[PDB]
Amino acid sequence: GKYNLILSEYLSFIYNSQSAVQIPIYYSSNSELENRCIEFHSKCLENSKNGLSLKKLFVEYSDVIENATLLSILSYSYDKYNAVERKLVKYAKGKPLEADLTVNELDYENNKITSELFPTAEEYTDLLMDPAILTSLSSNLNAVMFWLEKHENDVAEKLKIYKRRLDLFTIVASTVNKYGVPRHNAKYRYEYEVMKDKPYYLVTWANSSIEMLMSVFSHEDYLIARELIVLSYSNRSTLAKLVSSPMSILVALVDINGTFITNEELELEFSNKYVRAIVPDQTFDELKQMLDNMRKAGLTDIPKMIQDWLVDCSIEKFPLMAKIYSWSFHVGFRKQKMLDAALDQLKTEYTEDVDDEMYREYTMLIRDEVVKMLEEPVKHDDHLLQDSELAGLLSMSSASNGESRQLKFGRKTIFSTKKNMHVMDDMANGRYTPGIIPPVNVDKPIPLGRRDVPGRRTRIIFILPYEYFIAQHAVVEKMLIYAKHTREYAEFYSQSNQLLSYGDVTRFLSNNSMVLYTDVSQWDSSQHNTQPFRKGIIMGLDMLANMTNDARVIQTLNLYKQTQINLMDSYVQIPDGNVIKKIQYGAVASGEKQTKAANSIANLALIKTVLSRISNKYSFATKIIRVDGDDNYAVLQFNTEVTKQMVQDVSNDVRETYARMNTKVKALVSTVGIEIAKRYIAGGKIFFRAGINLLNNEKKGQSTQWDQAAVLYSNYIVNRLRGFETDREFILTKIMQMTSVAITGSLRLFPSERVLTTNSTFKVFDSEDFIIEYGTTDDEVYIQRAFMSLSSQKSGIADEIAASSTFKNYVSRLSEQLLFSKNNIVSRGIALTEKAKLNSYAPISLEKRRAQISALLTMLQKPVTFKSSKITINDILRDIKPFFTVNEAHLPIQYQKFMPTLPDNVQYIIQCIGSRTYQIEDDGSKSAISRLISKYSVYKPSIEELYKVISLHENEIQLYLISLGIPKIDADTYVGSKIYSQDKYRILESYVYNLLSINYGCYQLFDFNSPDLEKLIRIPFKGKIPAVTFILHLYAKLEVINHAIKNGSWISLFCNYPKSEMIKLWKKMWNITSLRSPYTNANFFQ
């Protein structure tokens, strides 16, 4: 309940001119008070129009400002020019930074003046520096300066925080003021004209530095931030890698004194096992070399901190190491040229001097894995393999982006990259030939996208024609079905939907065991991803062809084999100025349907071969092998306790055996912990890097500034949970900057706290960190209803596309492939489903989003005169709130701390009620209807759509299922079985869990079925209304958990809900009309 005050103070700060006026708008559910609100708003508008002060009106309508709820603030300012520089000159007292132009290997990566890199405006490109975020550097400077003004007169540790941040911002502000604040355009891009005489990386460096300095609280924070901010001005390439390198060894220096053990996808059983860390001298030499590299780059504080920690190598002081690791990733992205990044990726030294025996065994293992994955569906004539083309057509929405093509629908021309629209266009023009896989050779080389992650090297992505996806979809789906129940495939293994996000490596860690872990992210152009890998897959397909008598399955396998054959001899396109390089590339890359599963298969085969060779010199049992995306790790158990020499010998043997196959591996062997891309374990504890950048983005998103503010808050929450706390006031300042909309060049509307924190499509953040927003008061229900009224919007582009003959022809072909002939009713439902699937196209979704935002803005400019009987979640909670009695309770701490970087209050919740055991899926995946849908298409209807559908008539449900692509017989079986009667409860559970973010943020870490938690909830059971009991119990759990989060203490809840109230609420529980913005989903794991 602080956002509105901070907003008003920020408006005063940024519009300190004497002509600046803030007009606060209010709303109320009470008609008597709403009339006063309307009169107050009218009088404020009239006074501003006549230019009269509004102070007296705050006395005339002091009840409105008291009893009504603030809806927004209208700001009128007329002196906006050169305001940020006027504020900044105060903080530019320090010495500006001078870039070292001999730090980066590539010339254009040195932070020199833009003219020195792009002599003419035609040569200029901001792609190598673009923050790719819809917020300006001027806004970041304004937010930092507002924070400094607000906290200028703090005392105690607050004053120390202010002083540290003032020093860091003095650095940043002096550097920026030396050249002047560059001005963004409407697209938040920085043009050549405003960047000629500035350092090229000034804007992105300034954004990263502002984030870092606003993330500083302690002295160690200040030292790390100062070092990184000063060094990243000159270093743009190797700084993050330099700082993150030691961690891969540090995890191996901490003994385990008790640890966690994964059971099923989030369930941990805890061990009191003690394991000593066995570290050979070579590892210490490597760590010494890493620290020497740090110092050679100008680092003094970070290596000194690491050396100080190395005195004891204790897990209690390891949080500083985790802090350095997380901070390393906030020096921004490395958006080097596609040519250099690709050439780094496809830098290969292929040799004929490889071990033929090893390669033949590896190929045989790949063949065996493919056969194991696809034997049963191939032998039994699985429907998906019989209708592979139809399955691919139905699942096109889940395909990767193609290369942009000029499509025409009706009389409109578009430039979609969506493969479904490409299929539509080709069908309309007689170019749809699934049976032919286009070559990807020097005649039609593959265009390349890029995936960039801070610290990590850039990855190339194939952009293939849609025929590859059509050919590969069904086979890869069968592969994923197999891999979901295979524990070795960490990326895919899951009992229902959730992955082993904590990993499974600590179960077999012992004093007779060692864990070998290897980074394999650089094995895209390795010699083992060449002909051997593709030919192993081809041999598997050839074997599978003999196991089936269905011509359609054989044709599916033939098309998959043809895709592999074509990809064996493939070329890639890379632009370079005015010349396109066609580079031979017969290796693996993402952007193909099978890439993830195929990489897992190949890595498993390769590690099996390597371990087979390593068994020559040592006797051990391989306990587990896990291939988790960019990393692999295997646990080897020995008949003796592990010694230093054993660890060193195993590491050397693994490296040499991988080299025998021409694979360059840095084989890291430990006894106590590992470090992989998505987590690292040290001292029996698990850590996740908190490197999500806030003021910089990898690439320009297809969202709005509103949704980007929501994503900014979500990223801030995820970073905070992982141990990287940015000041919440700075985040709220950014939120108010990004959610404001210009009614005119002089008038700007700032939404209030209620607007932004309310559960709706417009939700951006929560008033309290880690607590889902809900409220039982009349105003909150009223505004939720009003916002729900604005959710439904149309798209003109979607309408024109759906009305075009191209879309109608596509729907007709889809229907005839679905065994319907001029049905006239089924076809219309299929057309609706395909029009919905068109929502993945960025212009359509953006048009809908902007329509919603515009409607919201029109509503916000006036007091909300909207009333409806529509039921929202706040209505349910208001109904059930009065019957809950609250008492003070106590829970002892009886659960282990396994995530040391969790915030203290979240950690308290975990210690008191425990961590999540098993997760109820948020999409209703384990409902009969959802399983039926997944049987034919990977398209996932939103849980809201399923919630609406499951309460319709039987024929309506049947028609919806047929539209999704389920055959009529199966849909009629589902409906006539009356299975929807049981399915509606699972659907309601998933719907409510989605609305209340039970599977997001900190809630995903909690156990909502904890015996300790349910010991605090006392709801006498009344049967035969499961929906009401479910919502009552979930609400009680949320209330208790949120109270503990906010206060750090516990409350018991008691609700003797009357039966009549239960029956009344039962009717409403199936008519809930509520939404929550997906942009507010804070996924702790990513």
Binding site: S615, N616, K617, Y618, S619
Partner: protein, 49 residues
């Protein structure tokens, strides 16, 4: 068991090589239990077999 012929050949080859190289030994082949042994992996025995 099904590698009977190959194992007979392997045993004969090993014995013949041992005898031929033992013909070249000039110092008494004294059998003692040494302080340290030569570790032999039974997986290597499986590979040979």
């Amino acid at each position: 068991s099904n590698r009977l012929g190959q194992l007979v050949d392997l045993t004969r080859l090993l014995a013949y090589n041992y005898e031929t190289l033992m013909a070249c030994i000039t110092m008494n082949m004294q059998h003692v239990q040494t302080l340290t042994t030569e570790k032999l992996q039974l997986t290597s025995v499986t590979s040979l077999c």
